Structure formats: C-alpha cells, structure tokens
Amino acid sequence: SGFRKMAFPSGKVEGCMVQVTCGTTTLNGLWLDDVVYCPRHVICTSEDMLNPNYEDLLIRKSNHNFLVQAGNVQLRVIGHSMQNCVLKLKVDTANPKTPKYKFVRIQPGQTFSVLACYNGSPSGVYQCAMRPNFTIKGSFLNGSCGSVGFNIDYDCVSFCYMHHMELPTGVHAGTDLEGNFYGPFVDRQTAQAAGTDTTITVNVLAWLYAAVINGDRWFLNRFTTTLNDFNLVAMKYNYEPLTQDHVDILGPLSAQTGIAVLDMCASLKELLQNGMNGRTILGSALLEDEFTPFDVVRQCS
Amino acid sequence: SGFRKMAFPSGKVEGCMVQVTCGTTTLNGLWLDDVVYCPRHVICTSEDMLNPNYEDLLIRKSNHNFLVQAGNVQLRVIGHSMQNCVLKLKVDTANPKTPKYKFVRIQPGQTFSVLACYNGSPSGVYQCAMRPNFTIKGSFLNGSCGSVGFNIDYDCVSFCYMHHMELPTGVHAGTDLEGNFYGPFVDRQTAQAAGTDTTITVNVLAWLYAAVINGDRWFLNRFTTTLNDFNLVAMKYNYEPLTQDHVDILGPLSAQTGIAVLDMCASLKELLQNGMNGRTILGSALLEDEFTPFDVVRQCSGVTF
Numbered sequence: 067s068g069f070r071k072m073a074f075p076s077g078k079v080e081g082c083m084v085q086v087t088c089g090t091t092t093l094n095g096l097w098l099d100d101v102v103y104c105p106r107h108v109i110c111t112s113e114d115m116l117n118p119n120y121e122d123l124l125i126r127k128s129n130h131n132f133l134v135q136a137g138n139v140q141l142r143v144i145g146h147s148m149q150n151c152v153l154k155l156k157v158d159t160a161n162p163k164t165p166k167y168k169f170v171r172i173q174p175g176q177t178f179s180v181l182a183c184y185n186g187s188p189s190g191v192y193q194c195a196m197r198p199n200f201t202i203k204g205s206f207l208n209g210s211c212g213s214v215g216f217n218i219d220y221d222c223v224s225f226c227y228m229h230h231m232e233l234p235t236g237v238h239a240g241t242d243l244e245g246n247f248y249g250p251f252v253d254r255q256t257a258q259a260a261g262t263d264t265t266i267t268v269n270v271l272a273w274l275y276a277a278v279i280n281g282d283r284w285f286l287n288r289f290t291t292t293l294n295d296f297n298l299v300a301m302k303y304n305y306e307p308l309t310q311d312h313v314d315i316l317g318p319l320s321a322q323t324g325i326a327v328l329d330m331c332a333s334l335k336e337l338l339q340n341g342m343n344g345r346t347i348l349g350s351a352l353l354e355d356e357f358t359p360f361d362v363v364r365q366c367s
Numbered sequence: 368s369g370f371r372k373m374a375f376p377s378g379k380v381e382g383c384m385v386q387v388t389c390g391t392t393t394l395n396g397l398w399l400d401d402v403v404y405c406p407r408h409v410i411c412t413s414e415d416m417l418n419p420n421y422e423d424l425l426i427r428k429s430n431h432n433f434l435v436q437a438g439n440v441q442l443r444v445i446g447h448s449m450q451n452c453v454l455k456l457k458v459d460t461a462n463p464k465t466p467k468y469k470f471v472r473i474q475p476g477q478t479f480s481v482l483a484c485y486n487g488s489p490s491g492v493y494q495c496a497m498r499p500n501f502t503i504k505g506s507f508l509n510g511s512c513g514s515v516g517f518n519i520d521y522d523c524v525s526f527c528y529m530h531h532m533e534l535p536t537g538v539h540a541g542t543d544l545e546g547n548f549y550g551p552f553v554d555r556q557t558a559q560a561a562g563t564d565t566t567i568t569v570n571v572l573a574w575l576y577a578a579v580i581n582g583d584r585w586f587l588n589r590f591t592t593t594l595n596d597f598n599l600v601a602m603k604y605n606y607e608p609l610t611q612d613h614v615d616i617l618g619p620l621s622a623q624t625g626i627a628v629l630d631m632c633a634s635l636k637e638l639l640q641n642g643m644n645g646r647t648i649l650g651s652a653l654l655e656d657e658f659t660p661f662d663v664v665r666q667c668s669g670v671t672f
C-alpha cells in the first residue's frame with residue numbers, strides 16, 4: 067500500500083551524462099554509443115542570443131572547439147551535425163555504459179523521470195508531466211540544460227525530453243531527442259510565454275482510482291453523469307476535455323475497483339464544486355494530475 | 368527555479384540489489400563486499416509466522432538453502448549469521464560494484480531516498496522522511512522487503528533503512544542495516560499499530576524558506592515570536608518542539624532571505640492559527656514537512672554526486 071510520486075531508478079541514465087563546453091558555455095550532454103546529444107545553443111555567444119543563425123555558427127566550429135568530458139576523461143570530437151535544435155557530436159569512443167534505449171516523442175499528460183544534472187554530474191531525480199501547454203514544472207538551475215527526461219518500462223530507456231530553457235513563470239521548455247521543441251517555443255531569447263495551463267483530467271481520475279485502491283472512498287457519491295455534461299462542468303474549472311479515448315483508457319482501473327468511469331467523473335464534479343472540507347486524498351489537499359493511468363497500474367499492481 | 372520532491376541518483380545502490388530466496392519466500396538483499404544483507408523473516412514459513420523463535424529457526428537452515436541471484440547469476444552462499452533482525456549471508460564473491468558506503472542510523476525528521484525493488488530488480492525511487500512515530504509513508508507491494516533507504520554525502524552512500532513490514536494504516540516499518548527496528552515494532556505478524564504522528568516543524572520552516580527563495584512570499588508578515596511562545600503553539604497543533612539547535616541549523620536560510628527563524632515562526636504560527644485562506648505554497652495546500660534544511664540548500668544550490 068501507499069502512493070508516492072515515484073521516479074524510475076536513474077543509474078542507466080547516470081552512466082550516459084557528460085559535460086559539453088563550447089566557448090564559455092557549459093551544459094550537459096547525453097552520450098549514447100559514439101554520439102553525444104546536447105542543446106545546440108551551447109554554440110551561442112552572448113551577442114547572438116536573440117536571433118542566432120545556428121547553421122552559420124556551427125560551420126565555423128572546429129571539432130577541437132567542443133570540449134566533452136566524461137567523468138575524468140576527455141572525449142575526442144571527430145564530427146558533428148545539427149538535427150533541429152539538438153547537436154550531435156560524434157566522438158571517437160563508444161560509451162561502454164550505453165543501455166538499451168529508444169527515443170520517443172510524448173503527448174501532453176504523459177509523465178517521465180528527470181535526472182537533473184550540472185557539469186555532467188547528477189544532482190537528483192524527480193517525476194514530471196508534459197503539461198497541456200507543452201511546458202514542464204521542473205527544478206532546474208543555471209547549467210541544467212541538456213538534462214534529460216526518460217521512462218524505463220521493462221528494461222529499455224525511452225528518452226523523451228531534453229531541457230533547453232526556462233520561461234517567465236518559472237516553468238520549463240525543451241525538445242525531444244530528435245531536437246523538436248514541445249510546444250511553440252524556439253531556442254532564442256526573444257519574448258515567449260506559456261499558454262494558460264489546464265489540469266490533466268484523465269490523470270486526476272486515475273489518481274482518484276488509486277485512492278480507492280488504497281482504501282479511501284469518502285469522495286464517492288450516488289450520482290453519475292454523461293460525458294458531455296462532465297466536460298461542460300470541467301471546462302469551467304480549466305480542466306482539459308475528457309475524450310472517449312480517455313474513458314477507454316480508464317477501463318481497467320474501473321474494472322478493478324467496480325466504479326464506472328462516468329461515476330468517478332461525478333465524484334470529481336463534486337470535488338470541484340465542494341473542495342475537500344479539511345480532508346485529504348492520498349496525502350494531498352489538492353487534486354493531483356501528474357499520475358497517468360499507466361503509472362497507477364504500475365505502482366498499485 | 369522550481370522546487371520538487373527530489374531523490375538522490377540511485378545508480379550506486381542499483382548495483383547492489385540481489386534476489387534472495389529461502390523456501391517459498393523471495394525478497395531483496397543488499398550485496399556489499401562479500402555479504403548479502405536481508406530481512407531475517409525471509410526464513411519464516413507460511414505455517415509459522417506469528418511467534419517465531421528466530422534463534423532456533425536459523426540453525427536448521429544451512430547454506431544452499433539460501434538462493435541468491437544477482438541478475439541472472441547465482442551467488443554461492445558460504446556462511447550465514449543473524450544480527451538483530453537482519454540476516455548476513457556470506458557469499459564467495461565480493462560485489463565488484465560495491466560503492467564507498469557506511470551504515471548509519473537516522474533520527475526522526477531526517478529524509479532519505481528509497482529504492483523500491485522486487486525480485487532483486489529496482490523498480491522505482493522516491494524520497495521519504497522518518498516520521499516522529501518512526502514509520503515511513505512509503506509505497507511498497509508484496510515482495511518489496513529488503514528494499515533500502517539511503518543518502519549520499521559527497522561520494523559516500525549512507526545506508527539507513529531496510530524495509531520489513533506494513534502496518535494497518537498503510538504506513539511502513541523497517542530497520543537500520545544493523546537490524547535494529549526504527550520504532551517500537553517487532554518482526555512478526557502480531558497486533559501492532561503506528562502511534563499518533565506529529566508534524567516535523569524544522570522541516571516545515573525549511574520548506575517555507577524554499578518557497579521564499581522561489582518567490583512565494585504572501586505568508587510573510589511583520590511579526591516575530593520567541594522559541595518559548597512558538598513551542599506552546601507547536602504543542603497545541605501536534606507539531607514537534609523547535610529546539611535552539613534547529614534554529615541554528617536554519618541559520619543559513621535565515622541570512623539568505625532576511626527572515627529570521629522566529630520571524631518565520633510567526634508566519635508558521637499564523638498559518639497554524641488561521642490557515643492558508645485559500646492560497647497555496649510551492650504548489651501545495653498543506654504544510655510540507657518532508658524537506659530537511661539540508662535538502663532545501665542542496666536542491667536550491669545544485670549540489671551533485
């Protein structure tokens with residue numbers, strides 16, 4: 067029993083983290099096989115942070131301009147290429163610690179673990195979710211760029227996020243490992259702002275099911291709702307629409323608890339209307355939306 | 368910016384986890400040098416778990432009764448002994464992945480990372496605190512026994528917890544790596560309960576400092592209090608007493624933010640007596656007490672391991 071925000075063990079990723087320095091900028095890179103992936107803005111200077119021409123900056127670089135350090139070992143760069151907003155540095159040695167891995171681009175509402183790193187060394191590991199507005203709510207300081215997000219279902223590391231930037235509300239933006247930003251952001255210091263964020267409804271429902279699995283029922287009620295009436299109410303609290311895909315996805319947790327999905331929607335409706343009246347659910351006084359249905363099944367079963 | 372419940376990187380510990388099987392019970396062990404440590408109740412039967420005489424149950428056991436698997440490799444047990452509630456299985460091979468480590472016993476209010484494991488395979492990592500009632504609010508399923516808690520201090524892993532059991536409220540109990548239970552618990556399936564818990568005051572104060580450092584300031588006020596006055600409020604609201612040593616420990620955060628501890632205590636006093644008036648702090652509608660002062664300084668300064 068118990069329910070915690072649980073990250074994947076980070077050791078398979080720790081063994082991939084390196085430090086990349088170009089000029090006076092240092093950040094982190096991800097060393098897989100004979101390639102180091104990092105944010106391409108490591109090649110910016112303080113003059114071209116607003117409108118960098120990355121193609122023009124990179125053609126001027128020599129391999130020896132990139133200083134890549136893996137623990138105490140300098141790696142030798144022997145070539146390079148840019149893919150969207152990620153730089154791929156070819157090195158003369160393959161990482162002997164390369165795990166089984168893949169690259170996946172995730173959808174809003176998905177969760178992943180972040181291994182926050184500075185100067186190529188790990189600081190800690192935590193769980194995040196891709197918000198509906200394509201930001202994440204991380205914990206990142208100066209130097210954290212190139213830190214990655216990942217899942218490790220089974221024995222394979224799925225890399226889904228590389229950190230690039232912080233926006234004015236203190237939230238974070240980045241790319242997949244093919245260098246495509248999540249959301250409309252660009253790796254330029256021109257004014258940008260995250261959209262109004264919303265709550266990941268399907269994830270809240272999953273967590274309410276987790277609460278029932280863990281022995282709590284105080285928030286249930288005798289009512290039900292149609293899907294459309296649920297979405298008309300949830301709208302008014304800045305909740306994301308619940309789709310029929312989401313209802314299907316909750317089917318297994320529904321079967322395990324005996325609570326029909328639309329009956330759980332009626333419970334959520336009442337919680338939005340009433341609040342918790344001094345009670346908690348799974349140790350929280352707010353409705354939690356950074357556990358997916360898959361996460362709940364992973365941790366409870 | 369940002370502030371998250373953050374665990375230590377777990378790689379040094381992942382290389383130490385093994386599977387231990389005795390009879391029909393399988394749980395986890397910790398392989399360090401040429402010893403595997405695991406809960407002694409691995410030796411208990413389905414027919415005999417209510418009032419075990421562990422002394423007597425182990426002499427019947429011999430070495431090849433314990434099946435130890437590191438990944439897909441069997442380790443040969445060559446000796447066995449008991450220390451308090453932990454079994455020590457001597458194996459024929461030293462763990463080549465043994466990190467720099469030590470065994471430590473922590474105090475209530477201290478936090479640590481838990482590497483939850485099943486069948487010798489790490490499955491997840493999360494941050495916990497030793498509650499004042501000596502339980503932890505973990506997440507553990509059948510087969511999780513022998514999962515370990517730890518901190519990292521520079522390059523050294525400090526192991527502080529091994530998981531043994533679940534209490535009726537859904538909270539968890541275990542031992543240090545010398546086999547001493549935390550709390551007034553015993554390793555048998557007799558009636559036991561967690562005591563009434565309290566809130567870890569010095570940790571709440573640390574988390575309020577983290578909030579200020581991240582720009583959440585609405586709860587600050589002009590007032591100050593004294594240690595004596597605040598501790599009466601703390602007692603009243605089932606908060607742990609605040610000692611002068613706690614005040615000194617928070618000193619750094621006090622200097623950095625310009626809010627003296629007794630200044631911040633007057634904020635916490637007001638949040639206890641009046642509540643949050645609908646607002647949140649660092650994304651929480653409750654007062655969070657599982658960040659230590661060290662945890663806050665570490666995360667807010669980017670310390671690495």
Ligand SMILES: *[C@H](O)[C@H](CC(C)C)NC(=O)[C@H](CC(C)C)NC(=O)[C@H](CC(C)C)NC(=O)OCc1ccccc1
Nearest residue numbers: 107206208209210211230231232253254255256257258
């Ligand atoms: C890499 O380690 C670092 C991580 C941050 C968490 C500090 N990223 C950057 O420095 C990044 C480089 C640019 C070229 C992508 N810049 C930012 O993240 C920057 C904030 C820094 C200076 C603290 N954000 C930014 O420029 O956002 C756009 C913007 C500009 C002006 C007004 C609003 C928004």
Ligand SMILES: *[C@H](O)[C@H](CC(C)C)NC(=O)[C@H](CC(C)C)NC(=O)[C@H](CC(C)C)NC(=O)OCc1ccccc1
Nearest residue numbers: 408508509510511512531532533554555556557558559
């Ligand atoms: C080890 O994998 C496992 C971890 C649990 C989280 C499943 N530990 C046990 O099975 C443990 C062994 C005993 C000898 C300490 N037993 C328990 O933890 C047990 C709950 C299990 C069956 C889920 N709880 C227990 O013994 O609590 C005391 C108790 C018993 C009966 C009535 C009141 C209190």
Ligand SMILES: [Cl-]
Nearest residue numbers: 171172173176
């Ligand atoms: Cl996805």
Ligand code: NA
Nearest residue numbers: 588589590630
């Ligand atoms: Na004050």
